[PDB]
Amino acid sequence: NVTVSIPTILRPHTGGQKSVSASGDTLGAVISDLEANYSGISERLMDPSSPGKLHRFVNIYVNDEDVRFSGGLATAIADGDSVTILPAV
């Protein structure tokens, strides 16, 4: 049980839900899980150029920690952690 906050731009993939539930031990695992339930979400978060690397203009925090500082998709994920996707500015 982790909660994922979805930014306005990606709510189509989630039937307009602001927030959805997911699970995985890593950010990677949570991403492909959301994909599982909410088709098309995933390509929008990844860099089209190089695999496994997040998109230049997307931010993702696991609980207030920027994943770019904790291993990106390898970033470890605990029960009741929260995840937050946001367009970069």
Domains of the chain by start residue, with CATH: 1-89 (3.10.20.30)
Rounded distance between C-alpha atoms, residue 46 and residue 57, angstroms: 10
Q: Of 31, 7, 15, 24, whose CA–CA distance to 78 is shortest?
A: 24
CA within 13 Å, CB half, 17: 13
**CB–CB of 81/53 below 8 Å?**
no
User: What tokens appear for 39 in the block?
Assistant: 């088709």
Strand bridging mode 82-87 / 58-62: antiparallel
Within 8 A by CB and 6+ apart from 22, the residues are 2, 3, 4, 30, 33, 34, 37, 83
E strands, 1-81, where?
2-5, 19-22, 58-62, 65-66
Rounded distance between C-alpha atoms, residue 81 and residue 23, angstroms: 10
For residues 67, 3, 46 and 16, what is the CA-based torsion angle, rounded to 10 degrees?
A: -140
Rounded distance between C-alpha atoms, residue 65 and residue 51, angstroms: 22
Within 8 A by CB and 6+ apart from 12, the residues are none
Task: Note the resolution in Å, 1 decimal.
Answer: 2.7
In three-state secondary structure terms, 88 is coil
Q: Of 47, 77, 46, whose CA–CA distance to 63 is shortest?
A: 77
Rg of the Cα trace of the chain? 12
